């Protein structure tokens, strides 16, 4: 494909486009008043479940293979839900189709909490992902391990500036992998095979920090990792 | 009384509060415990975002209620 | 006549409008009051996106109707 580069993208018959979806009352999170709650520059932010990402003409696609950086337009479908919702079913959602295109995707939740969170940014809204559709689920799962390792690394460097590479590996090896990843344990190679991505996530997290909190890039752990894994 | 504040990752914070505390006060206690600036914090209860000047009594936030904490994220 | 415009940021806007006003005219009124360029505005009523070039009477929109404003940011 001139966009892509096999499964195909479907959606319920009641799905609507992005602006119509965002005004559904199920997603109303404010009791509106004369002053407003958020800036006009802030995108509305919702959960999105049963999601699937596809190219400008139909094929399910990954998002981490460089298509986004080649400015290919990836659209997505799914059921938008209130931002606080933890139920990944379609229940209480609003089906949307041809959302986007994805301008940016990102990782958040460096909380110490259980979940790694993935988000999409469009020109209308931001979406924190819950469960992929059954037919997009194989593609989405390929990415999940490096996402979660990035979370552990950032969180360990946040809370252990004075720590060492071996202590980071011990944290990785003792972190029980979350369900649905279908692995018994993380291993030192879980970090090394994904080291370029992980290091890029750490530095992007550093860049988003305010110019008055301690960086995490320039650490003993990272320079060992950059050396040991050949990171550019 | 104790209330809980749950983030989107599932992380749960326990706070000590009184029904007369304002949402502004609760955001300050979240800052105290977690370091998050109040200007990043959106608190949600019973499906609605909460207003800084109103109190826990105004919203019927009760002992061991859970508030949802959503953050205005820093990013590049 | 008076209509309302509710945003996705929790604001309710009051406008002075005529049945013969086009959707573009309504967006210009929102620009006058909130500073939002009309090309970044989408107006939804009862599930339906309101199209430029139609009037409020074309959509049979009556006094005290509440329109729903969705913004498309410029760039990213």
């Amino acid at each position: 494909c001139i966009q892509c580069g096999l499964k195909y993208g479907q959606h319920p018959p009641d799905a609507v486009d992005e602006p119509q979806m965002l005004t559904n009352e199920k997603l109303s999170i404010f009791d509106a008043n004369e002053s407003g709650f958020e800036s006009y520059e802030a995108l509305p932010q919702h959960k999105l479940t049963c999601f699937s990402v596809y190219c400008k003409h139909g094929h399910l696609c990954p998002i981490d293979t460089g298509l986004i950086e080649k400015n290919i337009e990836l659209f997505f479908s799914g059921s938008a839900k209130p931002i606080y919702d933890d139920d990944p079913s379609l229940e209480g959602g609003v089906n949307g189709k041809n959302l986007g295109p994805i301008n940016e995707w990102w990782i958040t939740g460096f909380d110490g909490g259980e979940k790694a969170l993935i988000g999409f940014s469009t020109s209308f809204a931001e979406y924190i992902l819950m469960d992929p559709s059954p037919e997009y689920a194989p593609i989405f799962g390929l990415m999940q391990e490096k996402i979660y390792i990035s979370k552990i690394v950032v969180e360990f460097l946040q809370s252990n500036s004075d720590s060492t590479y071996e202590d980071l590996i011990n944290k990785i090896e003792t972190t029980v992998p979350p369900s649905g990843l279908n692995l018994n344990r993380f291993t030192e190679d879980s970090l090394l095979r994904h080291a370029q991505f992980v290091v890029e996530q750490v530095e992007s997290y550093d860049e988003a920090g305010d110019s008055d909190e301690q960086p995490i890039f320039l650490t003993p752990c990272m320079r060992d990792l950059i050396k040991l894994a050949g990171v550019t | 009384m104790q209330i809980f504040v749950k983030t989107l990752t599932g992380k749960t914070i326990t706070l000590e509060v009184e029904p007369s505390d304002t949402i502004e006060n609760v955001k300050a206690k979240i800052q105290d415990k977690e370091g998050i600036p109040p200007d990043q914090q959106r608190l949600i209860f019973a499906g609605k975002q909460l207003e800084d000047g109103r109190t826990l009594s105004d919203y019927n936030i009760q002992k061991e209620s859970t508030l949802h904490l959503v953050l205005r994220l820093r990013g590049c | 006549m008076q209509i309302f415009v509710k945003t996705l940021t929790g604001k309710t806007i009051t406008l002075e409008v005529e049945p013969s006003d086009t959707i573009e005219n309504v967006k210009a009124k929102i620009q006058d009051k909130e500073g939002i360029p009309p090309d970044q505005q989408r107006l939804i009523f009862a599930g339906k996106q309101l199209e430029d070039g139609r009037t409020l009477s074309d959509y049979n929109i009556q006094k005290e109707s509440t329109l729903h404003l969705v913004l498309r940011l410029r760039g990213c």
Binding site: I68, E69, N103, E104, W105, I107, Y205, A208, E213 | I36 | -
Partner: peptide, 19 residues
Amino acid sequence: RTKQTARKSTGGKAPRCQL
């Protein structure tokens, strides 16, 4: 307790995006 902002890391961004 020390300031700690809530952040996202960028997984991917289209070159169309300037900010």
